[PDB]
Amino acid sequence: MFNNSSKILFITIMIIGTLITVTSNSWLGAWMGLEINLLSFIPLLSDNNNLMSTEASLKYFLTQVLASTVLLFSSILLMLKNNMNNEINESFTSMIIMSALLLKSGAAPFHFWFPNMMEGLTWMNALMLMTWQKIAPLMLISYLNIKYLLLISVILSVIIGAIGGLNQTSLRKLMAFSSINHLGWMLSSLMISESIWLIYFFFYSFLSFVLTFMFNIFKLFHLNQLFSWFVNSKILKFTLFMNFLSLGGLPPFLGFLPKWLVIQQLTLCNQYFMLTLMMMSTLITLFFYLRICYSAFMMNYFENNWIMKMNMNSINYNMYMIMTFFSIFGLFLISLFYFMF
């Protein structure tokens, strides 16, 4: 996505606008930063070579400006009812604020734009979409204290995001549906902590960088395209596909750690039924992760024989192999970590 320096300019201004959003002490400067982030994320997610990217940017524009005007209208309504930004007893205007934030984030009652837009993108604007663009709404969700909207969103996110990814054989829509399920674990962590959410979001972001770099360097967009992917040693293809088992939450790899910290903090906060509802609905996520892992866990395949050289970037794959090592051997660093406490 670095074909121009103007895209680097749009990247730093969308970083600036997101930081204006998450540091605003009022409900209107947050909307100001949301509009800055929207202005800088319209030209990214748009390109001349791909036809679907322009209508996907149209879908993003209509979804975000529908969500931002409802966010502005409800914040002005809250300010008209009580003139401070906070609220003593929570009421329906906070529900409209949280629903407008859930349309921005992509919770499962309002998530239907997310994989339908994801069906026509590249793998770097998807990396910006499921990681950085989830910063601006989710950090405003932590300011509200209503429980049942978060409960409905978490439950609907972990059933709908896990079941709906089974039919999808495109890798982008499957990763969007997997990010919808990993969104629900972040909102379940938001009801109990503002630090365990940062733990889950940072390592989910880390897993998103290391897993979307596999599909961006080698240009993989399909489940059948993974079977035809040529790696010179099949042990390396087997080892590189352990990031799916890592992100699915398996104990020897990293990615078990943030889910485990969410489990540890939720049980200490006496919330057991919602945890069971999420973890019976996270096995389906590992099922469509293991359906990807059909293409590497067996050691020999009926490969197409016209391609015999593996072509790859140098700097991007050099950054990829550092993060693949810490995705599967990163549980040795739990003794050095001190940010859980």
Partner 1 sequence: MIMILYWSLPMILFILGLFCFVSNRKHLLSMLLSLEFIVLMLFFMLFIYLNMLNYESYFSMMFLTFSVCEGALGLSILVSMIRTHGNDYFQSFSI
Partner 2 sequence: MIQLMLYSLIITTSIIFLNMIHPLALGLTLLIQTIFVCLLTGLMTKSFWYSYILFLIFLGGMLVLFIYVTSLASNEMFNLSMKLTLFSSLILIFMLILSFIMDKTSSSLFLMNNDMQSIINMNSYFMENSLSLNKLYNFPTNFITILLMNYLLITLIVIVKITKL
Partner 3 sequence: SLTPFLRLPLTDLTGCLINHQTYDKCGKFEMKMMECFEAYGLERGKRECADLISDFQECVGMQKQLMRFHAMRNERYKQWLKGERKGQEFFADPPRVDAY
Give residue number: closest CB to ligand 3PE.
Answer: 233
232 is a site residue for ligand 3PE (CB under 6 A)? yes
d(CA 137, CA 105): 6
Q: Single out the residue of 62, 194, 202, 283 in contact with partner 3 (rule: CB under 8 A).
A: 194
Secondary structure element (H or E) that encloses residue 332, with its range = none
Indicate which of ligand PC1, ligand 3PE, partner 3, none lies near residue 152 (CB less than 5 to 8 Å, by partner kind).
ligand 3PE
For residue 217, CA distances in Å to 53, 60, 316, 324 come to: 19, 25, 7, 14
201 is a site residue for partner 3 (CB under 8 A)? no
Q: Single out the residue of 10, 31, 197, 200 in contact with partner 2 (rule: CB under 8 A).
A: 10
Q: Which of 40, 29, 37 is nearest to 75 (CA)?
A: 29
39 is a site residue for partner 2 (CB under 8 A)? yes
d(CA 100, CA 76): 13
Give the tokens for residue 313: 């970037």
Cβ proximity to partner 2: between 36 and 144 the closer is 36
**222: β partners:** 170
307 is a site residue for partner 2 (CB under 8 A)? no
Report the nearest approach of ligand 3PE to the CB of residue 93 (Å).
Answer: 18
Map tokens 């007893």 to a residue.
89
Cβ proximity to ligand PC1: between 308 and 336 the closer is 336
34 is a site residue for partner 3 (CB under 8 A)? no
How many amino acids of this chain bind ligand PC1 (CB under 6 A)?
14
- Return the range that interacts with ligand PC1 (CB under 6 A); candidates 9-17, 92-100, 174-182, 328-336: 328-336
Residue type at 328?
Answer: I
d(CA 138, CA 43): 23
Q: Single out the residue of 233, 270, 314, 335 in contact with ligand 3PE (rule: CB under 6 A).
A: 233
Q: Which of 156, 163, 181 is nearest to 284 (CA)?
A: 163
Q: Tell me which residues touch ligand 3PE (CB under 6 A).
A: 109, 152, 232-233, 235-236, 239, 328-329, 332
